[PDB]
């Protein structure tokens, strides 16, 4: 009989995106007062990642939950507040994300 191998169930990661003239190469979805991206969770989620763009190359994945950006915590953020946090984050965009096994 087979034994289940070790399995990572969820993870928090610090990822550092180097912004290009085209942006970060992500879309975000969700936010306080918006329709939840997932379940009933009103957090900020990565809904799209541009193939081979800055975010992809930094290791961002669709479905990642964005927790903080360059020391700004996103707990309780409305959508536009997260947009503002990312838009204004400069050339290196360091993000803490939560990720679960798919």
């Amino acid at each position: 009989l087979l034994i289940e191998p070790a399995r990572i169930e969820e993870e928090e990661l610090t990822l550092t995106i180097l912004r290009q003239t085209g942006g970060l190469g992500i879309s975000i979805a969700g936010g306080k007062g918006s329709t939840p991206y997932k379940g009933d969770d009103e957090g900020i989620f990565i809904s799209r990642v541009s193939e081979e763009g800055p975010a992809a190359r930094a290791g961002v994945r669709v479905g990642d939950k964005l927790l903080e950006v360059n020391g700004v915590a996103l707990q309780g953020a409305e959508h536009h507040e997260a947009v503002e946090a990312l838009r204004g984050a400069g050339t290196a965009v360091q993000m803490r994300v939560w990720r679960e096994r798919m």
């Binding site: 942006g23 992500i26 879309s27 975000i28 979805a29 936010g31 918006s34 329709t35 799209r48 947009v83």
Partner: peptide, 8 residues
């Protein structure tokens, strides 16, 4: 609620 998505 509104469904919000933003490309960045």
């Amino acid at each position: 609620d509104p469904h919000s998505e933003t490309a960045l």
